[PDB]
């Protein structure tokens, strides 16, 4: 090969990635100009690596997904993508905006992307994105079944569960290192539902005609053909920064195999380079940062319980009697034993208590979603996620996958810390789902 490693150029001012909503019209104007000139290369220089289609093919070429390589790959991906945009308009400080879908003011479709006849527009998008509707951060392809207020409440609860509760340590945030999918918190939710919510409905008839397969954002191979793809991933990249902001155990993976993993990218001059994961840990050392923006989901630890008291775990079947579960056709409840109870804080400091669902199997072309609750029964209202019992959710953009949930916070809030056995309830929302086994392990 002999391709050199990337040399960081000299860094003048920091590039500032701003929120996509209510951006000034002059910013939108040159963002459209950069994209327009990127798309022109599809015609004038189809094999130029910086052109629109060739950049889209980076996602459609790159096992980088459902692994701990998810965040660093897309950071480097967007790093060169942002540099290409700035260089096409002679703007060396151009910042790639981020779709602020974790903030109530950024949860609508960003207006700048919905202007037909502009370079940022894409007709291959779904219909539920208009009419001033809020995004559904737990979308599985259907229309929202709740009020917009409950939708907002669920969105912010999902953010809290995904950025705080279920990502207390690096491996659960970034993902894991076979066909078993080991996605982290964010790559599952809200990353996957945003793709689903923006894309066309699978089975629908596309522009002209083809049966849509979810193009553009809702299908993995064509997602890069929507300019909004990069704006979404800008906020995904921002989630990495916001996750580390509170310190403690939420730091970068220190494993040498992860740090020294390499990717391949062409820079804005069309020159090939190898890049290391260890060299993208600090965005400011790559020449960019995010505009400081409030994160109100940090305050959405649920304050109420769905059900008072404790479930009688003797009236429900044990995990050993339910799994392997051939089909999660409806809500089911089961008891499960904990490795230890009455844990001290020094034990919690060492090992997280993790509820793990093993061998989630389904057809990778179907929309999949199920929710997990502790200490409820089969009649739990799964539309109300702002409850102390809501643990998390699994979704999918035959596949085999794993879901891991950090439950120490819930055990404290619900009052189950001295219990050796607890109740778990699975609520399916979409798809044909089988589950091989469920366990509570004390992890890293
Ligand atoms: Cu994505
Ligand atoms: O992605």
Closest listed ligand to the CA of 66: 2
Distance, in Å, from the CA atom of 401 to the CA atom of 181, rounded to the nearest integer, reads 4
Q: Are residues 285 and 416 in the same domain?
A: no
Closest among 39, 62, 246 to 122, alpha carbons compared = 39
Q: Are residues 114 and 82 in the same domain?
A: yes
Last residue of a domain, one of 259, 280, 301: 301
Experimental resolution (Å): 1.9
CA of 56 from ligand 1 middle (Å) equals 12
Q: Could you tell me the sign of the dihedral formed by the alpha carbons of 430, 396, 303, 338, in that order? A: positive
Catalytic sites, residue numbers: 59, 65, 74, 191, 195, 220, 233
Boundaries of domain holding 415:
302-444
CA of 217 from ligand 1 middle (Å) equals 8
The answer to whether 368 touches 327, Cβ cutoff 8 Å, is no
CA of 217 from ligand 2 middle (Å) equals 9
Phi, psi of 429 (to 5 degrees): -115, -30
CA of 422 from ligand 1 middle (Å) equals 35
What technique determined this structure?
X-ray
Say how many residues make up the chain: 444
Q: Which helix (H) or strand (E) segment is 173 a member of?
A: helix 170-174
The answer to whether 355 touches 393, Cβ cutoff 8 Å, is no
Q: Are residues 264 and 309 in the same domain?
A: no
Distance, in Å, from the CA atom of 251 to the CA atom of 68, rounded to the nearest integer, reads 13
HSE toward the beta carbon, residue 341, CA cutoff 13 A: 12
Q: Are residues 63 and 168 in the same domain?
A: yes
Q: Are residues 221 and 249 in the same domain?
A: yes
Closest among 374, 370, 441 to 411, alpha carbons compared = 374
CA of 328 from ligand 2 middle (Å) equals 27
Distance, in Å, from the CA atom of 203 to the CA atom of 207, rounded to the nearest integer, reads 13
Closest listed ligand to the CA of 233: 1
Q: How many domains does the chain have?
A: 2
Strand, coil or helix: 218: coil
Distance, in Å, from the CA atom of 237 to the CA atom of 311, rounded to the nearest integer, reads 40
Q: Are residues 104 and 251 in the same domain?
A: yes
Q: Are residues 374 and 230 in the same domain?
A: no
Last residue of a domain, one of 301, 329, 349: 301
Distance, in Å, from the CA atom of 239 to the CA atom of 257, rounded to the nearest integer, reads 23
């Amino acid at each position: 090969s002999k391709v050199p490693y990337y040399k960081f150029p000299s860094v003048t001012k920091l590039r500032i990635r701003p929120p996509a909503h209510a951006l000034d019209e002059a910013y939108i104007a040159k963002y459209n100009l950069a994209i327009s000139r990127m798309k022109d290369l599809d015609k004038t220089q189809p094999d130029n690596p910086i052109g629109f289609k060739q950049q889209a093919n980076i996602h459609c070429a790159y096992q980088v997904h459902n692994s701990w390589l998810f965040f660093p790959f897309h950071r480097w991906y967007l790093y060169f993508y942002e540099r290409i945009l700035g260089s096409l308009i002679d703007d060396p400080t151009f910042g790639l905006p981020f779709w602020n879908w974790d903030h109530p003011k950024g949860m609508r479709f960003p207006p700048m992307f919905d202007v037909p006849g502009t370079a940022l527009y894409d007709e291959r998008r779904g219909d539920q994105i208009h009419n001033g509707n809020f995004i559904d951060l737990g979308s599985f392809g259907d229309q929202v079944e709740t009020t917009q207020l409950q939708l907002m409440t669920n969105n912010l609860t999902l953010m809290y569960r995904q950025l705080v509760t279920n990502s207390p340590c690096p491996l659960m945030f970034f993902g894991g290192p076979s066909t078993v999918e080991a996605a982290g918190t964010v790559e599952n939710i809200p990353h996957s539902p945003v793709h689903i919510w923006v894309g066309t409905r699978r089975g629908s008839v596309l522009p002209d005609g083809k049966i849509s397969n979810g193009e553009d954002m809702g299908n993995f191979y064509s997602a890069g053909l929507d300019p909004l793809f990069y704006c979404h991933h800008s906020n995904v990249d921002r989630m990495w920064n916001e996750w580390k902001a509170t310190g403690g155990k939420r730091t970068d993976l220190q494993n040498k195999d992860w740090l020294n993993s390499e990717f391949f990218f062409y820079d804005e001059n069309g020159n090939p380079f190898k890049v290391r994961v260890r060299d993208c840990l600090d965005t400011k050392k790559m020449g960019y940062d995010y505009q400081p923006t409030a994160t109100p989901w940090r305050n959405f630890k649920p304050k109420t319980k769905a059900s008072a008291g404790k479930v009688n775990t003797g009236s429900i079947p044990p995990e050993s009697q339910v799994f392997p579960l051939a089909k999660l056709d409806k809500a089911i409840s089961f008891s499960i034993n904990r490795p230890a109870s009455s844990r001290t804080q020094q034990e919690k400091n060492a090992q997280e208590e993790v509820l793990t669902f093993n061998a989630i199997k389904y057809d990778n072309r179907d929309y999949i979603r199920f929710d997990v609750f502790l200490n409820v029964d089969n009649n739990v209202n799964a539309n109300e996620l702002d409850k102390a019992e809501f643990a998390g959710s699994y979704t999918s953009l035959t596949a085999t996958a794993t879901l891991r949930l950090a439950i120490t916070e819930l055990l404290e809030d619900i009052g189950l810390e001295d219990e050796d056995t607890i109740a778990v309830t699975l609520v399916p929302k979409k798809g044909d789902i089988s589950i091989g086994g469920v366990e509570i392990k004390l992890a890293d």
